[PDB]
Design a protein around this ligand. Sequence first.
Ligand SMILES: CCCCCCCCCn1cc[n+](CC(O)(P(=O)(O)O)P(=O)(O)O)c1
Ligand SMILES: CCCCCCCCCn1cc[n+](CC(O)(P(=O)(O)O)P(=O)(O)O)c1
Ligand SMILES: [Mg+2]
Ligand SMILES: [Mg+2]
Ligand SMILES: [Mg+2]
Ligand SMILES: [Mg+2]
Ligand SMILES: [Mg+2]
Ligand SMILES: [Mg+2]
Lengths: 357, 357
Amino acid sequence: MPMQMFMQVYDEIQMFLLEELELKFDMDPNRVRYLRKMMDTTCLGGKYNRGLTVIDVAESLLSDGARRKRVLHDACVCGWMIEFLQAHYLVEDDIMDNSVTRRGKPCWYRHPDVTVQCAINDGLLLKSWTHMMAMHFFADRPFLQDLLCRFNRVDYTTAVGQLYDVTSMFDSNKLDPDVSQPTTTDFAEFTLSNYKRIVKYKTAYYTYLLPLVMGLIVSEALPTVDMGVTEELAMLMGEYFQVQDDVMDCFTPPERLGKVGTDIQDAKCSWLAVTFLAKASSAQVAEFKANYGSGDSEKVATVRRLYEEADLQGDYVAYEAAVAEQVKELIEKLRLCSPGFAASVETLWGKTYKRQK
Amino acid sequence: MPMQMFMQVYDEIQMFLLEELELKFDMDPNRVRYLRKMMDTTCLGGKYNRGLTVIDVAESLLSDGARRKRVLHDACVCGWMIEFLQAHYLVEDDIMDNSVTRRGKPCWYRHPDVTVQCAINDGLLLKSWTHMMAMHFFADRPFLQDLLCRFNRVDYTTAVGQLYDVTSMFDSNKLDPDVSQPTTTDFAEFTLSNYKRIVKYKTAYYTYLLPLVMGLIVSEALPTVDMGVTEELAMLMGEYFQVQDDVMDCFTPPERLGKVGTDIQDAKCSWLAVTFLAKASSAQVAEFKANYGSGDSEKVATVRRLYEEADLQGDYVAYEAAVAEQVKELIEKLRLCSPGFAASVETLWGKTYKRQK
Ligand SMILES: CCCCCCCCCn1cc[n+](CC(O)(P(=O)(O)O)P(=O)(O)O)c1
Ligand SMILES: CCCCCCCCCn1cc[n+](CC(O)(P(=O)(O)O)P(=O)(O)O)c1
Ligand SMILES: [Mg+2]
Ligand SMILES: [Mg+2]
Ligand SMILES: [Mg+2]
Ligand SMILES: [Mg+2]
Ligand SMILES: [Mg+2]
Ligand SMILES: [Mg+2]
């Protein structure tokens, strides 16, 4: 059922937005139809991990079934708010990362009828919809200001995180708008510390912390949990989710992965790249340097090979276990004063640990 | 004076933002310096008409010099919020219109050390800065929810406007993501009505209504003015402003304007394009259709020529006249009940009417 009503409120939101376009922006049915397709293709098809979480927290915490209905609905709107924020990111990320496929279909900007320019602006419309939906449905909620501050910080922090990711293959000392510069040939920026920073901000926040917080907000229970504990947790699960994407991006088939991995070509600061570079010998490192950051498929075939070659899967299992115990400890601190919350945090974790997704 | 204090608070905003990056986002000095360049290069160098209006309205309406200061400072923050919104729109716009030059200098995405993928994100950071500064300075302010609502509506309206603009070369009946299509060969969509709509939503709202509103809010005088009248005035002055843009985009020399015009090449729905097509003969219309929407400079020179041929500069003057007496009428209807607002509106008009920029 959670999914049942989630989809129902999707329909609501779609109706209100599209109809509002119709009436108040002088929109013809064609463009209106365009945007319905855009919205279904970018927003739907996922597993709604972040959205559902928000409901799940709300329902755990709500502990006159009108209050039940109000929280549940709000939670669903918040859920879609996060899902549309994510859709906005992916539309724009795929463009920035020059990706081919997402979710099993082609990236939005790679549809035959969607120009790159229009995709950038469709990206922006998606972000704007989060605000429009929030303002409509929470217009007379006491928490609306706090929700919109929080949400905007996250989205800002996500963009800062993007700045890190997108500038990780340039030696940060040569960073200047006025003077051009090429892919780093010593990679001395590739470092776990740098990697951790990029992920914290580009992923952790809008993926793990924001769904938890929104669910608490609609529940009027945010002060009841230990935030410090919650923040540590979100950061941890978030980092471990990005690393999992980094490994899959190299070693899970695009068919099961519903995308094709561009980390090796984009010369990305992926987990496999940093972990290799801190453990590998000199000949391994010199091959790598000569075989990373090039679309060539013999050179791409080399790096992938070279990872397998130096036993990264092993490092990933140790990491995973290190994380998994650290999560278990933290959740138990959290159960002490907030059992209901800790339950739904566990569930979320349960959806992440050793995902094949 | 207004210009001096306006520049003071910029430095205040810049400092708080860049420092917050340093402290709360773990940001190195190189990347901090980058954002300082980007922020100066995109937010500075124009005449700050949108910004300054806010201050002007605010000063006009504030009729214990602490209150004066408070209102003046907020008016400066709001102003920079709109200016930073403008900078956002222009960085993204330039990329979407594939433009060369802006404000006498190269477009942000064209700068030698700025990648297209980085520029897209720098745009987004610009937007995020509007929220951050607002939340910092208006934290404790009663009107902060209202300001952020209104602000986001306008931002959303501006993106919808751009959806119209960007898809004005595609037969709208044939608009389908899943299916490709080329530039219209009949231009049946290039109508005044369609032009009007594009302009209304893409320019009028953030350029005229928004500064007027924000100045009102920080004065705590919004309910004092006829909003219906104010809205007419803004739409009207706004439409005109764009039409003035479209005419310079083809006749004003790039060094006078500080930007090379692309409306012809991109096959845009400009005021010249829709006016011509509604008046021109059969042969005129067919040469147009054979020479519009092409980088080729002989094809471009022909269109240009053809506009002068049809004396579009006569139609413009009549338009201008009609707008100027429509504006004069509305400003008196506003002067009746709110003579302080009316004065500041007339100053704004004063800056638009027969501008050369
Ligand atoms: C508000 C910031 C605006 C700039 C662009 C949004 C940042 C997107 C951050 N992000 C997080 C996850 N992803 C997508 C990927 O995970 P994917 O596997 O989908 O390509 P990645 O490119 O790996 O970060 C993007
Ligand atoms: C909300 C994000 C959507 C993309 C960017 C916002 C739309 C920009 C609105 N706008 C208004 C005026 N301009 C720039 C021009 O006036 P210029 O001629 O200076 O490039 P134009 O592109 O003609 O509208 C952009
Ligand atoms: Mg990316
Ligand atoms: Mg990507
Ligand atoms: Mg990836
Ligand atoms: Mg444009
Ligand atoms: Mg442009
Ligand atoms: Mg123009």
